Amino acid sequence: GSVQIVYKPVDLSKVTSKCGSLGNIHHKPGGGQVEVKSEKLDFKDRVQSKIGSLDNITHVPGGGNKKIETHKLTFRE
Amino acid sequence: GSVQIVYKPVDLSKVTSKCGSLGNIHHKPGGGQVEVKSEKLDFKDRVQSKIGSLDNITHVPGGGNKKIETHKLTFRE
Amino acid sequence: GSVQIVYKPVDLSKVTSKCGSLGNIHHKPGGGQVEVKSEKLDFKDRVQSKIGSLDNITHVPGGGNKKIETHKLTFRE
Amino acid sequence: GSVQIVYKPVDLSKVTSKCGSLGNIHHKPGGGQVEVKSEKLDFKDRVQSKIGSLDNITHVPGGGNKKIETHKLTFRE
Amino acid sequence: GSVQIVYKPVDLSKVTSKCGSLGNIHHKPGGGQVEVKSEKLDFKDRVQSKIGSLDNITHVPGGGNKKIETHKLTFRE
Amino acid sequence: GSVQIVYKPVDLSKVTSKCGSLGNIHHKPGGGQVEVKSEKLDFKDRVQSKIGSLDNITHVPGGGNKKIETHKLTFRE
Amino acid sequence: GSVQIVYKPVDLSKVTSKCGSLGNIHHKPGGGQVEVKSEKLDFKDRVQSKIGSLDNITHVPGGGNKKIETHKLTFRE
Amino acid sequence: GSVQIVYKPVDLSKVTSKCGSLGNIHHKPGGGQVEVKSEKLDFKDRVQSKIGSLDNITHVPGGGNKKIETHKLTFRE
Amino acid sequence: GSVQIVYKPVDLSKVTSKCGSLGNIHHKPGGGQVEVKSEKLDFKDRVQSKIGSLDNITHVPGGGNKKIETHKLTFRE
Amino acid sequence: GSVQIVYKPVDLSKVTSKCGSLGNIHHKPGGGQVEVKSEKLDFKDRVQSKIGSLDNITHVPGGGNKKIETHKLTFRE
Structure with missing residues (x-):
């Protein structure tokens, strides 16, 4: 009972960003209250x-x- | 009972962004209240x-x- | 009982954005109240x-x- | 009982956006109340x-x- | 019962950013209160x-x- | 006398060519004679x-x- | 006397060519004679x-x- | 007399060529004669x-x- | 008399070529004769x-x- | 008479070439003769x-x- 498993996924993927300018962000919330x-x-x-x-x-x-x-390869018998 | 499994997915994908300008974001909520x-x-x-x-x-x-x-490859027998 | 499984999906996909200008976002909600x-x-x-x-x-x-x-490949016997 | 399965889907798809200008978004709701x-x-x-x-x-x-x-390939026997 | 498992995924991926300018961030919330x-x-x-x-x-x-x-390779018998 | 001029044209243009083959050009003129x-x-x-x-x-x-x-914006007085 | 001029034209134009083959051009004039x-x-x-x-x-x-x-905006006085 | 001029054009242009083959060019003119x-x-x-x-x-x-x-912005007086 | 000039054009342009082969160019003119x-x-x-x-x-x-x-911004007086 | 000039253009440009082969160029002119x-x-x-x-x-x-x-910003008086 010969079992051969060849697992060779090839990945040339590319996750890319280009931003010319990223500025002028203002995060000014009012004061909050939490009571638990x-x-x-x-x-x-x-x-x-x-x-x-x-x-x-x-x-x-x-x-x-x-x-x-x-990537997962699982092998039981 | 010969079993051959060849697992070779090929991935040349591309997830890309180009933003010329990303600016002038204002996040100014009023103050909130939480009571639990x-x-x-x-x-x-x-x-x-x-x-x-x-x-x-x-x-x-x-x-x-x-x-x-x-990627998952599962193999029972 | 020879079993051959060849799993080679080929992916040249492309998820792309181009934004010239992304600006002037204002997020100014009124203050909320939560009581639980x-x-x-x-x-x-x-x-x-x-x-x-x-x-x-x-x-x-x-x-x-x-x-x-x-990607999933499942193999029982 | 020879079984051959060849699984080679080819994907050259393309999900694309082009926006010249994306601006002037105002999100100013009134204050809400939640009571549970x-x-x-x-x-x-x-x-x-x-x-x-x-x-x-x-x-x-x-x-x-x-x-x-x-992608799923399932194989029982 | 010969079992051969060849696990050679090839990864030429690329996660990349280019930002020309990243400036003028203001984080000025009001003072909050927490009471537990x-x-x-x-x-x-x-x-x-x-x-x-x-x-x-x-x-x-x-x-x-x-x-x-x-990457995981699991092998029981 | 306040004057505000905002000049932000957005250009996502594209000048593109595709050719499958560009071959077999022959340029064999006869001999010219210029006398000035x-x-x-x-x-x-x-x-x-x-x-x-x-x-x-x-x-x-x-x-x-x-x-x-x-493009030309002209503000005389 | 407030004056506001906003100039933001948006151009997503495209000047494109596709050719399958561009071949077999022959340029064989006879010999010219110029006398000035x-x-x-x-x-x-x-x-x-x-x-x-x-x-x-x-x-x-x-x-x-x-x-x-x-494009031409002209604001004389 | 306040004057504000904002000049931020955005250019995401692209001048691109693709050729599959560019071959077999022959440039064999006859001998010219210039006498000035x-x-x-x-x-x-x-x-x-x-x-x-x-x-x-x-x-x-x-x-x-x-x-x-x-592009040309001109603010005379 | 306050004057503010902001000059921040953004250029994410791209001038690109792709060629598969660029071969077999022959430049064999006949002998020229210049007499001045x-x-x-x-x-x-x-x-x-x-x-x-x-x-x-x-x-x-x-x-x-x-x-x-x-690009040209001109502020005369 | 306050004057503020901000000059921050952003350039993420790219001038790129790809060639697969660039071969077989022959430059064999006949002998020229210049007499001045x-x-x-x-x-x-x-x-x-x-x-x-x-x-x-x-x-x-x-x-x-x-x-x-x-690029050219000119502030005369």
Whole structure:
């Protein structure tokens, strides 16, 4: 029972940006208020929690390009 | 029982942007209010929670292009 | 029982943008209010929750182009 | 019982935009109010919940073009 | 039962940015307030918690490009 | 007496040629004979002059397209 | 006396040629003979002059298209 | 008397050629003979002059496209 | 009397050629003969002059495209 | 009398050539003969002169593209 698996994907991809000018961004929100009331917190196993947050994010990348690749080869018998 | 699997996808793709000018963005919201009341929190196993949030995000990438790729080869017997 | 599988998709695709000028975006909402009342939270197994949120997002990519690809080869016997 | 499967789709597709000018966007809503009352929350297994939200999104991509591709080859015996 | 697995994906990909000018970013939010009340915190197993946060982030990378790659070969018998 | 002049023309033009083959050009004129006997020519100021010309031109562009664009804003007083 | 002038023409034009083959051009004139006997020519100011010309032109563009665009804003007083 | 002049034209133009083959050009003129007997030529000021010319030009560009763009803002008083 | 002049043109232009092969050019003119007998030529000021020319030019660019752009802001008084 | 002049043009231009092969050029003219008998030539001021020229040029660029850009801000008084 000969089994041959040849896995050769070829990737010449290209994720490209060209920006001549990227300027004059103003991020001026008014002040916010967050009020969270609780009594008991009983987190267990795998919990990713986030309680009472106030984020002001100015994210200005020159490219900000992404390439996400994933190769899997699974072999049972 | 000879089994031959040849997996060779060829990818010459291209995700491209060209912006001459990217400017004059104003993000000026009024102030917000968030009020969350609770008593018990009993998270368990896999819980991704987010309680009482106030996000102001200015995301201005020059390209912001994405390419997401996924290859899987699964082989049982 | 010879089995031959040849998997060679060829991809010369192209996701492209050209913008001469991208400017003068104003994101000025009025202030919002969110009020969530509860008593018990009992999340379990896989729960992705989001309670009491107030998002102001200005997302201005120069391209913002996406390409999502997915290849699967499954082989049982 | 010889089985030959040749899977070679060829893709020269093209998702393209050209915008000369993309400007003068104003997103100025009035302030909103969200009030959610509950007592018990008992989420289990796979629940994607979202309670009490107020989103203001200004999404102005220069292209915003998408290409979604999906290849599957399934082989039982 | 001869088993041959040849895993040679070839990657000539390219995640590229070109920005002529990236300037004049102003991140001036109003002051925020966060108030979180609780009595008991009983975290266990794997809990990633974050309570009472106020983040002001100005993230201005010249490229900010990402490439995420993942190769897996799994072999049972 | 406020004066504002905004000058931002946008040009996404394209002057393009495609040729599959550009071959087999032969330029074999017979021998020319030019004899000029010029005396007392008295050119003055701005003068362009051709005297006794034998021009054998073979001009075979694969394209030869052209685009002349002229923009002019004039603010006198 | 406020004066505002906004000048933003947008041009997404395209001057394009396609040719499958551009071949087999032969330019074989017989021998020309030019004899000019010029005396006392007295050109002045702005003058363009051709005297005694024998022009054998073969002009075979695969395209030869053209586009002349003229824009003019004139604000006198 | 405030005067504001903003001059930001955007040019994403493209002058492009593609040729598959550009071959087999032969330029074999016969021998020319030029005899100029010039006396007392008296050129003055700005003069461009050609006397006794035998030009055998073979001009075979794979492209030959061109784009002349002229911008001019004039603010007199 | 405030005067503001902003001069920021953006140029993302591209003058490109592609050729697959550029071969087999032959430039074999016959022998030319130039005899100039010039006396008393009296050129003055700005003069460009060609007397007794036998030019055998073979000009075969794989491209030959060109782009002339002229920008001019003039603020007199 | 405040005067502000901002001069920041952005140039992301590209003058590019690609050739697959550039071969087999032969430049075999016959022997030329130039005989110039010049007396009393009296050039003055700014003069460019060619007398008795036999130019055999073979010009085969794989590209040959060009881009002339001129910017000029002039603030007189």
